[PDB]
# Entry
Amino acid sequence: TFIELVKNMKGYKELLLPMEMVPLPAVVLKHVKLILTSQKEHQPWMTEMALKADQCLIHKATLDPLIEAMQQIILAMTRELWGQIQRHHYGIVQVEHYVKQITLWQDTPQAFRGDQPKPPSF
Amino acid sequence: TFIELVKNMKGYKELLLPMEMVPLPAVVLKHVKLILTSQKEHQPWMTEMALKADQCLIHKATLDPLIEAMQQIILAMTRELWGQIQRHHYGIVQVEHYVKQITLWQDTPQAFRGDQPKPPSF
Amino acid sequence: TFIELVKNMKGYKELLLPMEMVPLPAVVLKHVKLILTSQKEHQPWMTEMALKADQCLIHKATLDPLIEAMQQIILAMTRELWGQIQRHHYGIVQVEHYVKQITLWQDTPQAFRGDQPKPPSF
Amino acid sequence: TFIELVKNMKGYKELLLPMEMVPLPAVVLKHVKLILTSQKEHQPWMTEMALKADQCLIHKATLDPLIEAMQQIILAMTRELWGQIQRHHYGIVQVEHYVKQITLWQDTPQAFRGDQPKPPSF
Amino acid sequence: TFIELVKNMKGYKELLLPMEMVPLPAVVLKHVKLILTSQKEHQPWMTEMALKADQCLIHKATLPLIEAMQQIILAMTRELWGQIQRHHYGIVQVEHYVKQITLWQDTPQAFRGDQPKPP
Amino acid sequence: TFIELVKNMKGYKELLLPMEMVPLPAVVLKHVKLILTSQKEHQPWMTEMALKADQCLIHKATLPLIEAMQQIILAMTRELWGQIQRHHYGIVQVEHYVKQITLWQDTPQAFRGDQPKPP
# Structure
């Protein structure tokens, strides 16, 4: 319900991506190191990413309805991680434009899509 | 492991209170509705707050080692979640000072600990 | 003997708290890592802090009259070590006032001692 | 480990000297009196020297693995004392240049050193 | 640990390109002769560039100990290819283009992209 | 053979200083931390300088095959010490001063010279 309230606001813009268009776990965490280790001047948003990515390992560590439910949650958290990465790599403003086109390019039937719109570069 | 790596960075100001001081998870959700709803000109950080909030509910709705393991994350999720609440109410800069004052206050033995410091100005 | 000679000097402002108020040696090391690591443009005083810190560990690692004599220095080492921590956090000038306020507060009998003063501003 | 972290910083510069190039104990403490007694306007660094030199006497007073370990520590503290003395006698900036040359003049094989570089005067 | 000492630097960059990106060691040596031969002005980088590539030749004839050397040779190849690409195109372009191709791979196959063109 | 391809170059220099001149590998690593730590401005040489010294660390733990590796480690030490001296003093000074000491040695003992001073 809380997320629905945000979607009811003014000026809200999507930043996440469809569950299908999300890399696999574990490997997706690698981008975390390339943005944390190759960084300096700790900023507030960096801590947010660190405290979110590490959660997947905690849930993943349990692998060594309760069992099924945890696996589903990992996908949701993974989706959030990717949005933050794009919020850093391809700016924060240009990201909204890319996802805006992604929604249109996928919602329309496959007979009308055409070609995938390439995301903006760094 | 990742959070340990980030702590080894320059300009890192802690913003999370001890687990023993953060409110109960039920209480935290109450401020989420006010802060989210009682806001104008929606900002990107608002979306982040809502996404994390639903995660606690999902884990909370799951309880009804493995069975008890998820309970550990619920308490942890509040600690990160409560950090953003104080940023909106007090401010990021003020929070940094408050945490260290609390940390030193908690560090000192209770015999000569002194009066607990009060929160910063809104 | 030497410290007694220095105390007999002009402009001498005390900067060491009573042994009964300084944190435990384990707690002090925690602030060392943050202060050392969370710093930019390394300054000469940073090197001094690290050198003293390892001494406590050496004595601490030694425990595992003569046998118990070394334990006395461990507690003392913290008192001097904690003095530099407050200088970085609060400031040299503010610390001088705080110590004397604590000293007078501790000097006055507990019957009418009053509320313990709070630390200075960061 | 803490000292290693400092050595990993930016702008850090060596100020100590090889253990071999360190005067003997007791006698080295004499320079303490010549800088403390022949001084006025107590400065913060003066207390640091006083609280460090007096430690050797405390360790030395015990003479009247535990026994071996204490003797080793005295050498380490003595090395720190000399650096502070040079930090006062021959400035604080010129000291780094002298030690920089000392490292080169000793690390190279004795067949290539030449002549010892005289330290700068007062 | 030295990389860690520089990983915090502002201008630090991941010059080590993906292993799959670079070709086999033998082919890289070919470009070293071509780039050195083509270049005319003398700068310290070419003098040091030759020395870095020379070590790989010794390991070719020289060959847990053996296995490590095989990985070591590949380590230098990634470093060498960086200077090759940076010199031909530029320092910024390689840093700008390397990430793009990595993204095109780390994607759920179907929506990989459009085969991003090389610089 | 690459050195031969550059040995004919006008600006080619014998950067490989005498083996006796340089100290043991362990001591050299000490100066790498000190020089890198002291230096502040970011240039490609320091980024590449760390990588070149890093390889020596692996060989320390890793250890005709074994004997060759021992000589290989010493080969990198000579290269590393050159950058250390050139950075501290200068490129020309090292090239200017290295020959002087060699002459003082290759002489019939008695008339060796006057122990030429270091730069």
Remarks:
- Helices of chain B lie at 2-7, 25-37, 44-63, 66-89, 92-107.
